Amino acid sequence: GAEIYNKDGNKLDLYGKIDGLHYFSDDKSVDGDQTYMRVGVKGETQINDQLTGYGQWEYNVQANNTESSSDQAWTRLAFAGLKFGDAGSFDYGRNYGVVYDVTSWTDVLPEFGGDTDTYGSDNFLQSRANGVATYRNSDFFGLVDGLNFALQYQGKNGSVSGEGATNNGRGWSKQNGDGFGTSLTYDIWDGISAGFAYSHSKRTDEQNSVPALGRGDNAETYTGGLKYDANNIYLASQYTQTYNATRAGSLGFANKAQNFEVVAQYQFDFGLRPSVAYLQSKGKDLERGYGDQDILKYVDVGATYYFNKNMSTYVDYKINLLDDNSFTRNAGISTDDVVALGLVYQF
Amino acid sequence: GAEIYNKDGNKLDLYGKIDGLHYFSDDKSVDGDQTYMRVGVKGETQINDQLTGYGQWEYNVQANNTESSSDQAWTRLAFAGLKFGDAGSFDYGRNYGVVYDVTSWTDVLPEFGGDTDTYGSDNFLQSRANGVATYRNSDFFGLVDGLNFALQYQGKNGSVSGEGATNNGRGWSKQNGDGFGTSLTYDIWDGISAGFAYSHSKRTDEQNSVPALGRGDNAETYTGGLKYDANNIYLASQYTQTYNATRAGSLGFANKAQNFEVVAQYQFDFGLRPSVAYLQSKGKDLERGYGDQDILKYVDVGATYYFNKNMSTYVDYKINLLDDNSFTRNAGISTDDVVALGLVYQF
Amino acid sequence: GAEIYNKDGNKLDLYGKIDGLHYFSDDKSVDGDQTYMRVGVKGETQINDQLTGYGQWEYNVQANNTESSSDQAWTRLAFAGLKFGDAGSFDYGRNYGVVYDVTSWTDVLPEFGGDTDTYGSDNFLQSRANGVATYRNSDFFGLVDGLNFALQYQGKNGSVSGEGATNNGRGWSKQNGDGFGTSLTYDIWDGISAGFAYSHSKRTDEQNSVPALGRGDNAETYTGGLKYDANNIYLASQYTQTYNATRAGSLGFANKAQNFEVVAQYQFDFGLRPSVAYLQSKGKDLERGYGDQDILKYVDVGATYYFNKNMSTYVDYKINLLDDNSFTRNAGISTDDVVALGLVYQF
Ligand SMILES: CCCCCCCCCCCCCC
Ligand SMILES: CCCCCCCCCCCCCC
Ligand SMILES: [Li+]
Ligand SMILES: [Li+]
Ligand SMILES: [Li+]
C-alpha cells in the first residue's frame, strides 16, 4: 500500500494493482483478455493508547470489456472494526469467512487457484461474505506467541423475494442462513504453521429446492492446513471436507465434498519464483445418478518474476485433468487447459 | 475530510466512511446486512486573490450484496463551481436542491431520517437532484452577518422515450420539468437559526397520467425551520407543506402533504450522543377514497458513541406508528419497527 | 495530475475532472443534463537505473442520472507496462489504439469531436480498446525530438456466445478479430508536425452476418495528419480512409469511408481559446441501395476560457449539416444541432 495521509491520529493507505492479463484457452468462456484492476483504502485511527479503530474497502474493476458493458465493478471487502490491546479485535461488514484463515495458505499460485476453484466468494464462510461479525485474537491475549484464533457469526442473506427474503437478497448459490465459524492457527516457530477451521451455517429453502443437487438443513466445513515458509521455500497444503457447502457448478451443491490443495514454490534472490501445485475437489453422494464426481482437478505450473515491490510479471499454466462428461457439461465446469500471461503494477 | 494535496494553489480532500451496518426488522425488504461505504473528493483552486474554483464528487458504494449483484454503486453528488468574494458562488451538476438547506437541520438521526423519509432523492428540489444550477450568497454580500440565501434552477429530466424524453430519462417518480427554488437562513443569535425555503417545479405528462394518485401542473414546497446548536445541545424542527411533490409510496404523489420533523440531542464530553426524534408526513386530498392518510409516522430513539472524529458506533430504533391499512399496503409503505446497529470508520 | 505519493521508488498521481455539463438540442437522446466526472491513477516505479514499471487506470462516472439508474460508470483505460531507458516501452491492457496517435490532433474541440464522431471507442484500433499490447518509442531512441513511433497488437474480442466467443464478448459493433497497428509522428519544422497511422484487424463472423451493412474479412485504416502549434495558434487536420471499419450508425459498417477533420484555434494570454472546426465522414459502397452516404457532417464553433490549469468553462456549438434521409433515419444518426455549456474543475 501507499500511505497517503497520516495526521491527528488517523492514517490512510491507498492500495491496489493494475493487472494487464491475457488467458489462452480452448474454452471460449475463459479465453481472451482478462485485464482488471483493484483499488482500496485501509484506514486506522488511534483512539487511545490501547484502542484503535479501523476500516477497509477493496474494489475490483474489470477492464476487459467495453464502456457499454454492465456489471464490471464490485466490492470485495468493506468493513469497520475496533482493536483493544491484547483483548482482540472485532469487525463487521463484507469480509473473509474464517475458513480462508487456513485455506488462504494455498491461495498463492501465480494466477489460478483461490476462490475461483475448490471454494468461491459468497459461498458461506469459505471466502468473502456479506454481513460477517468477526472476533480475532493474536498470540492468545499476548500470552502465547504465534497462537491465533477467530470466532465469526453471519446473519442470513436470503432470497430476493418471498418468505426467505432479506433486504440484500441473491440467488441460491450465494445465499446463507444464520451461521458461525471458528479458526485456529499456530505459527509454532518462524516459518512452520498448522491451522484448523470449522464452519456451520443454516441453509435456505431455495438452496433445498432450486438447484438440482444437494439437500440438507446445514452447510458445514472442516479444514486442516500446514505451511512451511523458510529457506527460500514455500510449501503449503489444505484439506477441507464439506457437507452441503461446495458448489457442483450450476447443478447445485455436493452433499459431501473432499477438497485438497498443495503447492510448492521457490524464491530465487534475483526475483524469479517458480510454482507447482495440485488442486482437486471430489463430490460425493450426488443425486440424479451422479454418485461420485470430480468437480475440479488440475496440476498448475507457473512462475512470477518480481522486478521490485511495485512491479511483477507472470506465466501460469492450468493443466486441467477433468474429462468432459454429462456432469461437467450440465454443471458448466471448464475441462480445458489455460495459460495466463500477466504484467502487474502494484501500489 | 483528509487533505491529501495542497500545492500551487490547488487543494484536494479525500473523504468518506465505511459503515458496518445491520438492520433488524420484521419487514424483509429492510431486515439484514446493510453495510455500505461512501467516498468523495472535494477540490478547490485559488484562481486569483478573490476567485476560487471548486469541485466535489460523492459516491455511494453498497457492500451488502454479492460481487455478481447489479447496480451497487452510484453518484450522490458531482458539481463544479466558482466562488467570488462577496458576490457569491455558482455551481452546476448533481447537487442538493435548496429545500434541503433547511430540511437538513433535522437530518441528524443516528441512522434513520433524511431522504429516506418525508422526502427522497431525485424528488424535485427536495434532496439530491440532477442538473441543478445553484447560486449561493453568504452574509448578504457581506452586509448582514448570519443571513444566507440561495437561488436555484433545474432543467427538465424527462422520460426514457417519447415526446417527453431527455438524454438522461427516468421513471415518473424521479422526473421533473423546469424548476426553481430559493432558501434563506438567518442566525438570529449565537447558536439559534431560522430558515425558509420554497420550490416550484413543472410536473411532467407521465407524472400526470401514469400514477394512481396526484394530478397538477406544478409541484410546490414551502418550508420553515428552526435550529438551536449550543451548550452541547442540538434541537431542530422543520415543517414543510407540499403540493403534488410528496411521494405517496409507489402510488404517485399526494395532492397536498404536511411534513413535520423534530429532533433533540445532547453531546456528552466522553463521546455519547443520545437522540430522540419524531417524523410525520400526512397526505391530504388523496384520490380513490384514500382522503387523508399518514405516509410516514414514527418516533426515533438512538445514540451514537463517538470514539473520536474518525470512529463511531450507534444504535437507532425506528418505532413505527403507522397502522397496516389499504393505503400502506397498496403504496408499499413499511409499517414495521427497525433497529439499526452500526460501526463506522470515517475519513 | 496531483502527486499524492512519492516514497521508496514509487510515485502515484491522482487525476481527473468534474464537468458540470448541459446540452441543448432538439434531439431528445442528447438534450439535457450531461454532468460527469473522471478519476484516474497514474503510477510509476523505478526498478533500476534504466527500467521503470508503470500503471494507469482512468474511470468515467456519469452523474446525470438517478441513484437507481444502471450502467453509469466504466473504465476508459487500465494498463501496466515497462519502460527501458530510451529503448522504448511496452504496455498491455485497455488502452488507445495507435490510430489515435494521429487522429488525436483534431480531438481538441471545446466539447464535441473525437471518439463520438468519425470513429468511436471499442472500434478496432481507432480509440480506446480492450487487450492491446503496445510498443512505443519516444524521440527516436532519445536522438530526435518529436519523432515517435508505435507498434501494437490486439487479440480477438469476440461474441457473447457461440463459436466466435471470447470471455469478454460483446455486440458486433464493438467486436474485433486479431489486429495490428502502427503509427509514426514527427516534426518537420519547429511547431509543425506530420503523422501517419495504419491498422489492420480481422473482422468477426457476427460483423459479416448480423448487421445489414459492411462485408469483409479485414478492417483497415490509413491516416495522415498535420499540426501547427506555435505563436498562440493551433491548426490541425486528419484524413483517414477506412475499409469495413467505420460504423454506419446502427446499420453496420461502411465498406469504405473517407473521414476528414480540420480545426483552427487561437489562445489568448488571458485564457480565452476560440475554436472553429469542420468534420465529415463519407461512406462509400453501402449495401441495400444506400450507395454513397454522409455518415457525419458538421461545422463546430466554440470557446474555452481557462481560469488556470485546474478550472475552465466552455461553450460549443455543433452546426449539423446532415440532411434527413432514409439512411440517417434507419441508422439512427442525429441530424440536429447541439449547444454544450460546461464548467470544469480538474485535478
Ligand atoms: C431563462 C429562461 C428559463 C426557462 C424559463 C422557464 C419559465 C417557467 C415558468 C413559466 C411557465 C409558464 C407555463 C408553461
Ligand atoms: C513505423 C512506421 C509507421 C508507418 C505508418 C504508415 C501509415 C500509412 C498512412 C497512409 C496515409 C494515407 C491516408 C489516406
Ligand atoms: Li446433504
Ligand atoms: Li481436460
Ligand atoms: Li393536485
Numbering used by the authors:
A (entry chain A), B (entry chain B), C (entry chain C): 0 to 346
Question: Can you quote the paper on this entry?
Answer:
Another important mechanism involves the modification of outer membrane porins which enable the non-selective diffusion of substrates, including both nutrients and antibiotics, into the bacterial cell. Resistance-associated mutations have been described in both major chromosomally-encoded KP porins, OmpK35 and OmpK36. Mutations that mediate pore constriction have been shown to consist of amino acid insertions in extracellular loop 3 (L3) of OmpK36, a motif that conformationally determines the minimal pore radius.
To that end we solved the crystal structures of chimeric OmpK36WT with D and TD insertions expressed in E. coli (OmpK36WT+D and OmpK36WT+TD) by X-ray crystallography and compared the minimal pore diameters to those of the previously solved OmpK36WT and OmpK36WT+GD structures. Notably, OmpK36WT+TD forms a particularly narrow channel with a minimal pore diameter of 1.88 Å. By solving the crystal structures of novel OmpK36 variants, we found that the TD insertion causes a pore constriction of 41%, significantly greater than that achieved by GD (10%) or D (8%), resulting in the highest levels of resistance to selected antibiotics. Contrary to the observations in ST258/512 and ST16, the ST231 phylogeny suggested that the TD insertion was acquired on a single occasion and associated with the major clade. The acquisition of the TD insertion also coincided closely with the gain of OXA-232 and an ompK35 truncation (with both likely occurring just prior to TD acquisition). We enumerated lung CFU counts as the outcome measure and found that both KP36WT+D and KP36WT+TD (as with KP36WT+GD previously) were outcompeted by KP36WT.
